[PDB]
Amino acid sequence: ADKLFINALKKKFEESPEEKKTTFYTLGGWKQSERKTEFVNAGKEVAAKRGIPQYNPDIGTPLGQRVLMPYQVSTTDTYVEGDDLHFVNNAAMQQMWDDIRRTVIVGLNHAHAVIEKRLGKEVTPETITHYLETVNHAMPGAAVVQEHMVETHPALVADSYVKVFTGNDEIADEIDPAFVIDINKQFPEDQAETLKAEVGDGIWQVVRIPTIVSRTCDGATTSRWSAMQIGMSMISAYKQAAGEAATGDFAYAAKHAEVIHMGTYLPVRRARGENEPGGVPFGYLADICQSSRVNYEDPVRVSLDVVATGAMLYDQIWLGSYMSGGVGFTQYATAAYTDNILDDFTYFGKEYVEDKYGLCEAPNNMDTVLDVATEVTFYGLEQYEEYPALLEDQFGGSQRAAVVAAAAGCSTAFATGNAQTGLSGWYLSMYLHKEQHSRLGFYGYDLQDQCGASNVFSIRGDEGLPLELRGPNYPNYAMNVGHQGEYAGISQAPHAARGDAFVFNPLVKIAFADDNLVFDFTNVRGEFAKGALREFEPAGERALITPA
Amino acid sequence: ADKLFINALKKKFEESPEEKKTTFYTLGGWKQSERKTEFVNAGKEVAAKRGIPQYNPDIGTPLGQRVLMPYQVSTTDTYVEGDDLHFVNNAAMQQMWDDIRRTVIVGLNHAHAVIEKRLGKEVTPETITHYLETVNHAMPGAAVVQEHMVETHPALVADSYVKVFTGNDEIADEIDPAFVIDINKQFPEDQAETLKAEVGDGIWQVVRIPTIVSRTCDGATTSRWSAMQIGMSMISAYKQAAGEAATGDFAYAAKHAEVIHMGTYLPVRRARGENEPGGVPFGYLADICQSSRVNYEDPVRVSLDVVATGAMLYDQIWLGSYMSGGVGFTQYATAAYTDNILDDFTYFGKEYVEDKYGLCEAPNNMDTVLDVATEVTFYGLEQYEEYPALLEDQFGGSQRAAVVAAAAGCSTAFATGNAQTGLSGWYLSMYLHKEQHSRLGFYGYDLQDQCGASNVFSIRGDEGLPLELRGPNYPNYAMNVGHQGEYAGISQAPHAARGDAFVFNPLVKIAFADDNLVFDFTNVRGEFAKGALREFEPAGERALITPA
Amino acid sequence: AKFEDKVDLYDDRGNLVEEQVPLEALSPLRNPAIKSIVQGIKRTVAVNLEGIENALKTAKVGGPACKIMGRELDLDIVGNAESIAAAAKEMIQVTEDDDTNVELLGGGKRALVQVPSARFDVAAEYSAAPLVTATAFVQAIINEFDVSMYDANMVKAAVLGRYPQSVEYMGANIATMLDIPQKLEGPGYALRNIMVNHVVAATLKNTLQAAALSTILEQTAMFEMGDAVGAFERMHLLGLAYQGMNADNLVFDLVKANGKEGTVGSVIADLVERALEDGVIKVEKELTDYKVYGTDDLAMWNAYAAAGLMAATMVNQGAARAAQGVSSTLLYYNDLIEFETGLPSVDFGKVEGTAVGFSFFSHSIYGGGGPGIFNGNHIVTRHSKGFAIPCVAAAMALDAGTQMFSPEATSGLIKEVFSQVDEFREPLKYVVEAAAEIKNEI
Amino acid sequence: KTAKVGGPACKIMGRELDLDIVGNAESIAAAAKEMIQVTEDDDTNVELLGGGKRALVQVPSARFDVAAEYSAAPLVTATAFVQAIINEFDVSMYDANMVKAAVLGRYPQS
Amino acid sequence: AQYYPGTTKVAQNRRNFCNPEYELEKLREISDEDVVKILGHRAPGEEYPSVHPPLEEMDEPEDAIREMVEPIDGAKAGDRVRYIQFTDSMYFAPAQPYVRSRAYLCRYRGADAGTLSGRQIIETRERDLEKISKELLETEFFDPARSGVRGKSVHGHSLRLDEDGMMFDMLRRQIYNKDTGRVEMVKNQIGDELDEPVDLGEPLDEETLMEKTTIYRVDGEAYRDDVEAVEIMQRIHVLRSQGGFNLE
Ligand code: F43
Ligand SMILES: C[C@@H](OP(=O)(O)O)[C@H](NC(=O)CCCCCCCS)C(=O)O
Ligand SMILES: O=S(=O)(O)CCS
Ligand SMILES: O=S(=O)(O)CCS
Ligand SMILES: [Mg+2]
Ligand SMILES: [Mg+2]
Ligand SMILES: [Mg+2]
Ligand SMILES: [Mg+2]
Ligand SMILES: [Zn+2]
8 A cells, every 4th residue: 555654745735755856935935834923913912912922923043934834643634733732732641641640559458457457447338339429429629627718619520539449340349330340341351351460359449530620730749649638538538537557557548658650750950750750651552542442453543642642741741841941842743643644654563563473472682672773763764765655745854863763673683572772773863863864953953862772771870761661760761852652662672562462550551441541541642633723621720710 | 997807607507606505317318408409419419420329428427517607718708618618629729739830930041041141042031021922822832843733632731831030120121011920010119129130130931831730740740841932932032952961951951940930849758859848948838829910908908818818728738638638637737717807816916016016126135025925825725715616616625725825826926026936926926816716727737836935946957947947848847737827927927017019939939920821819718709609610621632 | 185175975875984985086077987987878788689680580670560562681690700709899899808898688680889989089979889889799609600782771671770861770780878069959969768677677777876876967958058056056966966866865865754654745844844954045024924935055055855755755766666657756845845934946937837737647648658758858858957867767666567568569679788887787786886995086 | 238138139128137257257167167167077168268259168178978979068067057157146036047048049949 | 744835724724635634524434345436446346456467476686766666556456447436516515626635645656646626636556545435435534515526528617506505526426416405416426326325424514614614815814814824835835936946
C-alpha cells in the first residue's frame, strides 16, 4: 500500500510528495491561516479591552513565508493547524495531565490490618462497601463528623471519587460494583490472569481528587488530600473515636506506607513535589496509557500510543512549560504523533524483525542491536530523502532524530524482547544519523545521545538502570526535548511484543482502566484530536460560580 | 457606640446577642439552609450522571442541629453562608492565589549592562519601549523569530503582560505609559518619595504569566516562562544573533541573578518549587496586599486587610489543601475576616495605644509587650464572655485564639513600631488565654505557641529571624492553622502605624500596585465578598475552546 | 576545660562507675567513644543478599509492586555468599588489614559492612558508605556468575533500586541508619534523621541504652548545627549528661522512687524537691500561699528538669507498657512544672511545644503516625534542641506491643546488622568508660 | 546600618542599627575564635583581612570528625560571629535578631 | 506540691482537681455495667480483648528500668488501649480541658491525655480505663447538663445553652426529662442507642456550678482580677523570652 504518511503529505501541499521544488513568499504571511487570523483579531480585542498591547503579528519576523501546515493526528482522520495541538489551546491535553496529577493508588492492606489487629474489628466485603459509600461522599470535600462544616459544591468536584480493585475475583464480586475496577471486564483473559496473579489477595484504592483543586494547587496535594478523606472515612465507616492514637496509623499508611505516587519528587534545581511530570518513570507512563488492553494484537499501535502519551506530557507540558515556557515545544512532540510518520517507520521495523527472527526470538545481544537499529535507521532516513515534502514537514533535525531513533529502538526491542537492547539501538540510530546527514538535532540535542552508548549497560551509581526505571530525572535525560516520550514507547515495545499485561507496575496499569476518568486513556491520539477540534469537555471549570 | 460585630450577630440569630439561651434540633437539619439544599440536589445529579454515589446528607452525622450561620465579610455589608467562602467555591480566592503564583519581578539592570559592555549597543527609553512592545507580544506565548511557530490563543492568555517601574521620574515619563506602573500616581506623596528613593535609577519588570498555564503547571514554572520570553524579546528588540554566547547572560540574569520570586523553594518533606504559598515570607504577603497605599490614614484597616489576605491564602489554600485537603479550613480563616470581630478588638487596641503612648512612641521593650498585649487580650476574651452569640459564632478555640492574639500583637506593634515586640505580644496573648479559659486551640494548635516566647528573640541558626523574614517554612510555623495570616498582619502593623510605604521589599510593594491585575489587591475583603456572591470573573477558563 | 562542672557517672544498673568526671569528657567534641559511634553510623551498611537474590529471580526491582516481566535472573547468591562477600571486601577496602569489615549473617542471607574510615576523611559527607558498598556488591555478584553486559543493570536495580530517577535509593536492598543528605530539614541535621524505631532496634529495646543512644545522636547534632556553640554549649552538655547519660544517677533514682505507684505529677514533685536540695533553685518571692522559685543557673535548672522529664516518661509509659502517652508526658510534665514553680520548663517551652504538635500528629488524620516513626529531623519533632526525642526512644523501648508500626515492622534489617556493633547496642557503657579514660586530659 | 537584610532588595524600615564592627574587628574576631575552637592549640584559624573588613576562618578539624557532613563550618562560624558582635556592643534582646539576619540571611524560612 | 498560683475560687478548684490528696466530691452513683455501656468498647459479659500476649508469657530480657516500673493491671493482661472523652461548657462546667489533662497526669498512672478546646481525652489499658471512667463520671469532674461524654461530634463547649440549661449535643446522647428534672444517658459516647438508658442525676444548680467551676469569666471570677495568677503567667513569658535569647 502507500507509505502511511502519503495521505497527510498530499493534504498539506499542492505538489506531489516527491517534488523537490515549490513556491514561497506569495501566501500572504499569516493571512493564509484561519487560526492566525483568529489570533490577530483576538490580539486586537485583548489589547483594546485592557489598555496594554498584546498579540501583534508585526512584532519581530513575519510568520507564513512558507506553507503553515495542517497536521493529521496519527490513527485519526483529523487534520488541524499545529496551534490546536499546543497544550494551552487543547483542553484534552490539559485534562490528560490533570487526570494523572490528581490520581494516587493507596492500599487497604495495612489499613485492614490496623482495623483487625489494633482496633479488633472485622473486615468484610460489606464493611468495605460501607467504607466506599462514605469515602465517595467525603473525598470530593464533604463532611461526615463535625457540626457546622462548610463543604465543596458537589457539581464543582464531580470528577473526584474512589474505586478499588483486587486479584481475588470472589472478593471483587462481593463489593458493590459501582466502586470496583473489574479486571475481568477491562482486560483480555490472559492479561487479566497475569494482573490478578500479581495483585493476589491485595486490595487497593484508586483515588482521584478534584481537578479544580489540582489546578489551584499542585501534584503533591494529591496524596495528602486522598489521605485526609480516607482518614475521615475510616473514622466514620468503622465507628472509631474521632481522633485517637490509632488514627495516626491510618494517616501514616495512606500518606507513606502503602501509597503509590504517579511521580517521585525532584531535586532542588528543578524543585517540585510528588505527582509532577518529571517524577513519572517511563515504565509507569507506558502503564498509564491503556492502549495495551485494547490494541494488544498490534504491538506497534500499543507502543506508539505510549509515544504519543509521553511526547505530549514530557515535551509539551513538562519540558515546554514547567521547565521552560512561552511558545514552547508543540512540534518537537507532534513529530511523534502526527502524519502517521513514526507509524510507517515502526511497522517497517516490526515486519523486518518478524521475518528474520520472529518477535522476541532474536538473541539479546549487540549483534541484534547492530542489525535491526541500522536497518530501520536507514529505512527512515531514506524516506526524508525520497520525499522532500516529508523533509519539509519534519523540518527540525531534532524532530527527525527522535522519530527515526524511536522506530529503531522499538524495533530492536521487538526482536529481543528486552528494553535495554532497544535503548542501545536508539543511540546507534543517532550516531548513524549524525554521520549520514552531517547534522542531528538542536545545539544541545545529543548530550544524552553521546553519553548514551556507554550508559546503556553501565552499572554505576547514577548511570546504571534498566530503561523501565529511568524517567525525566535520570541525569543525562533531565533537560532535552525529543527523547523522554520516545523512551516511554521503547519501554513499552518489548512488553507489547511479548504480550505482557504491564511494563513496570501492575497496580498503575489497573488504576487507569477506568471509564470514570475524564480523559480516555485507551485512545490518547483520538482524545488529542477531539481537544484540537474544541470538542473535549474538561473538568475543573468555574462557570457554576461566576457571572452568567 | 455598638461594638463593630453587633450588626452581624443581630443578622445571624433571633436573640439579642447578650442572650444566654436558645433553641436547637428543630430547624430541619440541612433543610434550613439554601446552600446545603443546593448541594443535596447537586449530589443526586452528580451521582446519577457518573454512576457512583457522591454527596449524600444521610452519610455520617446530620448537619444543622444548630443554626447554620451567615457571615458578614468584614468592612462590607455582604452576608453569606460559609460554603461561599470555601476556596473551592470562591473564584476570587482562587484568582488571588493565581495572581501571586504567576508573578515574578525581574530586573533590567544586569541586562542593560550586558547590552552596553558585552554587545556594545546602546539602551534608551525608546529602546526600552520597543522591547516592551516586543515582550508584551511574546510573554502570553507568541513568536518573534522562527518560521512555522504555533502559538497560544491570545484570548486564553489575555491576563499575561509585562510592565516596568523605576524611581527615575523622567525615565518613567519617557517610556510608553501603557507599560508603566507609575509610582506617583498609585502612591500618596510621602510613600512615593520613599519607594522612588529605594528603587533609584534601577528599572524592574513585573512579569505575569497566563493564569491558564499557572493552573496547568506550578509556581516554579513562573520564572522560567518569564525568562524564556524576556530572552526571546531581548534577541528580537536588540537585534542580536538568535542564540550566541551573550544570550546565556540574559538567561542567567532573568532566571537567577536579578529575579525576585514571590516564594522560595521548600525542603523535601514538603517538597515544592518556587512561587508556592509556603515560600512567601510574611513581609512579602504584607507588601503584596495594597491596602497600605489607599487606607494609610487608618493603620487598623491596613493591618487587617493584610490579615485577610494571609488567612485565606495560608490557611485555606496552603494548609487546608496543599498541606492537607478535603473539607479543609475555611472557618479557621474566616474568623479573621468576618463579622467585624477582629476589627472591633484591634480598633480598641489602637485607641488604647494612641491614648496612652501615641502610635510608635512606646519604648521598644518587654514592659510595653506586657502592658498592651495583656489589656487587648482581656478585652477580646471579655467580648466572648459578654455576648454568648459571639462565642457561639467563633465556636472553635483555635479561631478565638488567633483573633484575640492578632489584635494583641498588632496593637503591641502599633505602640512600639517594631514587629518583633508585636510577635512577643502574640505569644503572651496565647498563654493568658489558655489560663483564662482552661483551653486554647485544637490538639496541636500551640506547638509554635509554646516554642513561641523563647524563639521570638533567639539568634540561633534555625530559630532566630526578624518576623518580617519568617514565613510558612519557619520550622515552628510549618504545620498549623490559625497563625500564618495573623503573623503577616503583625508584620504589617508597625509599618502601618509608622506610615512606611512597605514592610520588607519595596519592589514587591510596587509590583502589585497595578489595576491590570485580575484580583483588586487594594480591597481584598471586598473581593472575597464579590467571589462569595458569584460575581467575580476569574482568568484561566477554557470556555473559549470547549463545546457550547 | 571551659566549664567548671563535674558529674558522677553510673552504669545501666544504677551503680557508680566513676566519680567527679569533668562535664567536657562526655562532649561529642572530646569523647572518643562518641567519635567511634558517629564514625560507625557513618560507615556502616546492612546488605540484604537474600533480598537481592529474590528481587533478581522475580524481576521485582525499582520500588513497591514494581516488576519487569522477562528480566528474571536466577543467581545462587546466598549459596555463594562467602566468595561474593570476599570479592566485595577487596573492592571496599583501601589497603589489606585496614578497618574495612565484611561479615556474613543469617547463614549468608545478610552482610554487615563497615566501609573504611580513610574513605570518609577525604569525603565531604557520608554517602560513600551506601555508594561504595552497593557498587562493590554489584560488581562482586556480576563477577561471581559472569553476568553478561545485557543483564548486569538488573543487578544494579536489585541492589540500589530506582536511583537516580528517584532521589532516594527507592526499592534498594541495602539499608543505613542515615538517610540521604537531600532529605535534611536544615544543614547539620543528618544525625537527627534517624528513625526512633532504628535506635530502639539497635539497642535491643534496652530502655537506658535507647535513651543514651538517642541523646548522643541528638546532642552531637546540636554541635554540627552550631546550637551548642558559645552561650548555649554548657546547656547542651548538661542535657546530654543528665537526661541521656544518667549523670549523678538522677534519672535512675527518680524512676526508682516513682516506679511502683507514681505518676508524672509525683515525678515533678520529687525533681523540684531535689533541685531545691542541691541549690539549683531557691525561693525568690512569696505570693499568697505560693512560692515563686528562681535560679542563678538556668542551664543547670534545665538539666535537672530534663532528667525529671525522662524519669516521668519511664514511669508513665513504663506503667502502661504502651509508648503512645510519651506525647502527653512531654507536654504535661512541662506545663505542670511551670505552674508548680514559676520557672520555665525544659528547653524554655520548646519541649512542651514539640509535644503539643507531636500529640496532635500521633492522634489525628493529618500526618505523623506512631511514636517510633519520629526522629529529630521530622518536621513535627525537630523543634526542641535534643530534649524530646530521647524520651520517645525510651517510651518505644518500653512498648510491649501496642504499635502496628513497631521496630519489628519497620526496622528488622537494621536490628539484625547494627545491634551486632557493640558501641551502637550498648553506648552508655562505652561512652562512660571513654569519659573515665580521658578525665585528666580535659 | 541600612536594615537591608534577608535577600535582594529587602529592607525593614525602623530596624537600622549602627554598629562600628570593622573598627572593632580585632576584638570581635578574637571573641569568635574562642567559640569556634575546641581547644587553644588546635587547628582553628581566624585571620583579619582588608584592614578588618573580612575574616578568613578555618573551623577545627575535630568538629568534622564527629559530624555527618560539612555544614558545621558555616553554622559554627555564623553563630560565633553573631554572638561576638552582640557581646561587643551589648546589642539588646530586642535588636539582636537583626545581627542574625545580617549574618545568615533569610534562613530558615529560605 | 502547690500546683497553681492565685487567690480566686477558680484557682483553688484547679489546685483541688490536681491534688491526689483532695477527695473529689462524689455526686452520683453509677454501676459497673453502666460505665461499661457508656464507654461502648465491649459488651456486658464480654472478656477483655488483647492486643498482645500477657507480659509473663513474654519473658523479656533484663532491663533495670522495666524491673523498677510496675505495669498497670491492664498492661500485664495485654488489654487493648481504649478511651473516654468529655466536652465541658464554657457556661461554668466544673471541669475544663487543661484542668483535666493536668489533673489526670497527677492522679492517674499510665495515662495518655489530650487537651483541645471542644473535647478532652484519655487513653489507657481497657480495665484501668473502666475504673478511672467511673470516677470521672460519678464525681464533680462531671455535671450532666454542662459536661458531655462524647467520642465524636463534640460541638457544644462554646454554644448557648438550651431552654433546659443543657449543653448542645449534635447526637443528643444526654436527655433532660422536663417532668423529672433528671438527665438520662440514652446513647453511648460514640452515639449508639443503649438498650436501657443510664440515670445521671439532676444537673447542678446555678449557685453550686459557680462554687465549683474552673473557668474564669467576667460574670464569675475574671482572670484579670486574679492578679497573682496573671503575674506568674507573665513571669514565665518573660523568663522564656530572655532564656531563648542568651540564657539569662
Ligand atoms: C475528627 C477530628 C480529628 C482530626 O484529625 N480532625 C477532626 C475532623 C477534621 C475534618 C472534619 C470534616 C468532617 O466532619 O468530615 C476537617 C474539615 C478536615 C478535613 N478532613 O477536611 C477538620 N477537622 Ni476539625 N475542624 C475545625 C475545628 C475543630 C474543633 C471544633 C471544636 C468545636 O467546638 O466544634 C475541634 C478541635 C478543638 O476542640 O479545638 C476539631 C476536632 C476534629 N477535627 C476531630 C473531630 C471532632 C468531633 O468529633 O466533633 N476541629 C474548629 O475549631 C473550627 C474550624 C473547623 C475546621 C473546618 C473549617 O475551618 O471550616 C475543621 C477542620
Ligand atoms: C506533618 C507532615 O506530615 P507527614 O508526617 O510527613 O505525613 C506534613 N503535614 C502537615 O504539616 C499538615 C499541616 C496541615 C494540616 C494540619 C493543620 C492543623 S488542624 C506533610 O504532609 O509534609
Ligand atoms: O538553537 S538551539 O539549539 O539553542 C534551541 C533549539 S529550540
Ligand atoms: O481534633 S484535632 O485537634 O486533632 C484536629 C482539629 S481540625
Ligand atoms: Mg474587579
Ligand atoms: Mg544511690
Ligand atoms: Mg515524692
Ligand atoms: Mg459503686
Ligand atoms: Zn497547578
